[PDB]
Amino acid sequence: NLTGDIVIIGAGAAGSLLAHYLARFSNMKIILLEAGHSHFNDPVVTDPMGFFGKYNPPNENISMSQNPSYSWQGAQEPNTGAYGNRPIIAHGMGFGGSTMINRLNLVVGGRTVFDNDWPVGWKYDDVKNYFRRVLVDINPVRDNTKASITSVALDALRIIAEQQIASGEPVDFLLNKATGNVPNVEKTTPDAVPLNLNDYEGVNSVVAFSSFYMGVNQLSDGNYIRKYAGNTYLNRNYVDENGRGIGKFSGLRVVSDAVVDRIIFKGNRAVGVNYIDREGIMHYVKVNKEVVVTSGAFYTPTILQRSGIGDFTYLSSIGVKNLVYNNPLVGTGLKNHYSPVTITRVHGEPSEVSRFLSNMAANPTNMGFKGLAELGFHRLDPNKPANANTVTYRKYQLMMTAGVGIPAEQQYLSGLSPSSNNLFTLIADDIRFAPEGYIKIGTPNIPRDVPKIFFNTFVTYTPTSAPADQQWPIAQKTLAPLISALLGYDIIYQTLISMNQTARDSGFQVSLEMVYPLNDLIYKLHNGLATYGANWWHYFVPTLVGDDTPAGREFADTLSKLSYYPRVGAHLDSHQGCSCSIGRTVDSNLKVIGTQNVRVADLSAAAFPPGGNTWATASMIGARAVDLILGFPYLRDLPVNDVPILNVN
Amino acid sequence: NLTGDIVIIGAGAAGSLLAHYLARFSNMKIILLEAGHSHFNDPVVTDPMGFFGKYNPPNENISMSQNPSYSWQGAQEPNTGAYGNRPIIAHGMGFGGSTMINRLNLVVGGRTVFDNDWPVGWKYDDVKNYFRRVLVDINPVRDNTKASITSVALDALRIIAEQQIASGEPVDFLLNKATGNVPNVEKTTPDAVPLNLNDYEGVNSVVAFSSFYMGVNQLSDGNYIRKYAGNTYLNRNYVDENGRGIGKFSGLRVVSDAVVDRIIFKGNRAVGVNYIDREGIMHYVKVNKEVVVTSGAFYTPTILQRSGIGDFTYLSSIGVKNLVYNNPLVGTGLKNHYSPVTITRVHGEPSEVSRFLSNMAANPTNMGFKGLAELGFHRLDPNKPANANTVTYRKYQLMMTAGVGIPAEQQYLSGLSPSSNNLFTLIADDIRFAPEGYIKIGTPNIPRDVPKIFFNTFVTYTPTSAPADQQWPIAQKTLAPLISALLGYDIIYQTLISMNQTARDSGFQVSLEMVYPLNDLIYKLHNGLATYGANWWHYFVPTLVGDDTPAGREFADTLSKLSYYPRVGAHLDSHQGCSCSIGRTVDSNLKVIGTQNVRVADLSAAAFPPGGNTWATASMIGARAVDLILGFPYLRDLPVNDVPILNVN
Ligand SMILES: Cc1cc2nc3c(=O)[nH]c(=O)nc-3n(C[C@H](O)[C@H](O)[C@H](O)COP(=O)(O)OP(=O)(O)OC[C@H]3O[C@@H](n4cnc5c(N)ncnc54)[C@H](O)[C@@H]3O)c2cc1C
């Protein structure tokens, strides 16, 4: 009963697309099991303002990500590098996966991030068509309400970019080699050409723009809707309430509220998978040809290990009765970003400061994401690729936001009350984040929301009684995240001083200065950078360098004092992935090593995170997997003018 | 059963002509379905005074347009721009469509209105013969009883026209470029040549005349009859009570009281249409070659959308099970006019004021339509075509009427009791009205009288915290209808002062002044126009200009105070159309885009409303469609001396 040539686990960001383009482009019987259910008529999801809690009950006013009925609750172990706290990250449960609860921003990643870090047969020129297909299928829209702050910021970054171009340094964070001598920045003219950060040819690596492309749409009424995988690939036009396909998709048979705990094996090939229905009773599903797993970043290692594939020593220590294959790499090598935050306050006359921040309110067409640029490398960064003098990378993503987005305790401590209406927010984050972790299960019975999740982000360095030059490379490798965070702070400071001069030039007689990071510290950091140079981070370890000069010890105190911001004055970005990268757990065909008929086709099978937000990465993976499993480039050849018909239901 | 090569939906203003000239000029079997029935022996329709209710029952004294047994009841949504009211507009149901309940006035439109706004292959030189055919087939007659007021008005407009000609301004509302230096105004001589506003060569764009051409006739008895499509194209000479043609029209088979809710399709071509008879039971009609739809302005979008052609997202939201084609333009871009009204009272001796308004009573040969001119553009109008310095357009239509035609509440508030016999009426209306709307269905089951009809006419402008010169074009575009209404008021004021001086010159020692619009406001508006000039409308938004001078704030108060007249002191003219303009829903052959064998040939398929009343536009469309569907210019070549024989039965 309930057989299937291809069995798909989870209707995540790639599961829905895989099921759709697999049922349509073939004639086999396909069955999909998803833990969540459709939310097509849920006002909290469809309305973009539901992210801010416009439909919450009065006595249960919690966020959608913190609701265990919408997402997995992945509580993590205490963090040695984050002052011994236990933050909780979530994965959206339901059709579309984590695209039901995100902030609806799309980035493609770039050209170099796929050209260098990815293995052969996987570069940008092979996934360009899949990326374009995904983007046109989503069909995003830019921001509609334009503000005066954005033009001033654009001209400021333009001035900084032209100064850096005239400088002659090898690489900086406003240098786009593929463009040329002309700075890669948008124009402040009201009739400027809208510059895109997702160009089809990948010519824009680091560049300043005016807006991103939200995953929203405007309806005939005037209401805005949320566009994501669920309402783009698996609407009512294809699957009914009985979970059956119609038309040429009749081979698909999707089952909702179905979580699968284990894949049954015959020793080296899969024969069936079992799930538990809403009755609380178990069920059996028989697999014919292959098994597809789309369980997301944090939870494909668990389903792989619990099913019998993984480190046999630790699995035996846990108590796994049935063992299949032994790799010491299952679940290791996952990556995630981190977003330090800064707050800038404007001082002046009330009218001028009220007019300066015009057109900033949270709107469904932007969700507060005005955005500035995807910045690159710092001039003082020690940890840079060897071939940096040949290509330009992506390291930072500068985005502007209204209000003061900071944890409440830090808001009270710093005094930045949201009642103040003369301040805004800009965020610089790291997309090539260094620190790494691991996931291990604790019980081989059922997939639980809390496995052993060790993630230490900003660790320190303990000097030893060894020669300094012998140990310095180790310290440089270890202290990368703090270096990146402080370089981001310096970049924000340069952008801010350019903002001040440009705003004074543009007729607004106001001044913008940093207040949140205790500007004394930031100004001292800038002075120390200028007076020291490439060896600025040597004083991160005070007793190792042993300068013992008042300037040197004061800089050591400043560096130790400023390390608290990157650790506590931010919130962790939920872009985890790449826990089963190609070569570690799967080959270049996304098939498991040593196994015969199991395939994994989500973000968990990514070699390295992209140079941007990873919405399109998962779907793209699925798209590629569609033609890898079918055997012909059916999906990649389809013309650009073919999008699934969007049904609101 | 009941097959047909050509199936015609509705015997509207164009349906009857289409059926007649299609059955006569071909040999195919034609079947016509109409929701109404013949009213050839109904005294309310035939008698022109039936419009004023001369045959109403004592306990059901309602107008013919407000009777749901004669017309559709198109109640509209609340109007933000009209103080939140819900006026109801109607479409005449029966043979001839809305020509059974209209006021029987014919205008051709002009030369420029077809030369500029219409696409290629559709200009005036291509539809001149169709227009002449329609006019000679109707064979209208002018007014018979001439009054003294008309000559005085004609000489007043002549004086104003010669002054404007001597002025040298680029364009005004008594400047006809095609005529020359001599003013385009009729002569006050008793033996003057009757000037026509429907000249075959289209040389009269803006010109003053003495009367229009009513759609009436005088019978041998002396009784007057109503001439319209029903008694001009589908009399007893062609179709009997069994709905069968006779003679060379025997291929036609018309069915009355037949409303069609949906056109059945085979995927891209129509195969049949279904209707419901007077028994209340359904029926099936099979289509052979093409389907013709003539359902009128408000109701062709509904029949198009409900049949499966239109915006698939909104149709799916409604619940349309069968879907055909997807356009975001079905039902959008419709136009209608609006007629502001003014009342003038004469003060003097009772004998002189009784003699001044001689020959004004409502007569079937004029129906109170003495009329003055089709006026043009104002000198202070900001919204004018770029090429206005090359051609002359039509914007206003000045017509005189007896009594006080104004809603009863406003009559009581202003005190203009109809018991007063020293006042008359003149109407200036906009034929190029700016505000636009949309129609959307709410149930995909049956054509209902009340779909979602959003029509906001006179909207306001809300200033923002932005530079004034940056936003001024937006305000100018938005505030067009109020500008046009106040310019019409100023035109009426100039005509009125010329009337006063000319009447004082012509031996009548009386004075004519405006009373209804609270003449203080009109005189202040004239003074403000004179003292300000082209930037008179800048004070429509008081805080944006920020003059804050007693004259300026007083003018702002006057402009805000005078905006109530155009909103409430009038009634909406029922000349809606152009909801499926060429290029939006149909091509230049009036055929639906993407469909194979469906054609629409009524006013709904008009690119832009004409520069006049749209009686002849629909029929003309049909005429053109006759030779488009047959393939040869059969109808357009027929000599001028061929009219269908008029049977009273
Ligand atoms: C607050 C927030 C904001 C974000 N903003 C952005 C943004 O602006 N841009 C961006 O690119 N990304 C953003 N993200 C991240 C983005 O939502 C996802 O990280 C991205 O879609 C990649 O993850 P995924 O969809 O592959 O994982 P998912 O597909 O979401 O992984 C979980 C899925 O697997 C299924 N599943 C898992 N285990 C099982 C099981 N045992 N049985 C059955 N089904 C199972 C679940 O039902 C669910 O469908 C944001 C995330 C959060 C939390």
Ligand SMILES: Cc1cc2nc3c(=O)[nH]c(=O)nc-3n(C[C@H](O)[C@H](O)[C@H](O)COP(=O)(O)OP(=O)(O)OC[C@H]3O[C@@H](n4cnc5c(N)ncnc54)[C@H](O)[C@@H]3O)c2cc1C
């Ligand atoms: C009070 C009043 C005064 C007017 N005065 C003038 C004037 O002086 N001059 C002027 O030019 N115009 C005037 N008009 C407008 C004029 O009557 C029409 O607007 C003009 O004929 C253009 O509309 P139409 O005939 O194409 O629409 P119509 O043909 O009248 O549209 C409705 C027709 O379609 C048919 N129909 C619709 N839906 C269906 C269906 N589902 N099944 C079957 N049949 C269907 C109806 O039976 C009817 O025959 C006036 C209108 C009104 C209300």
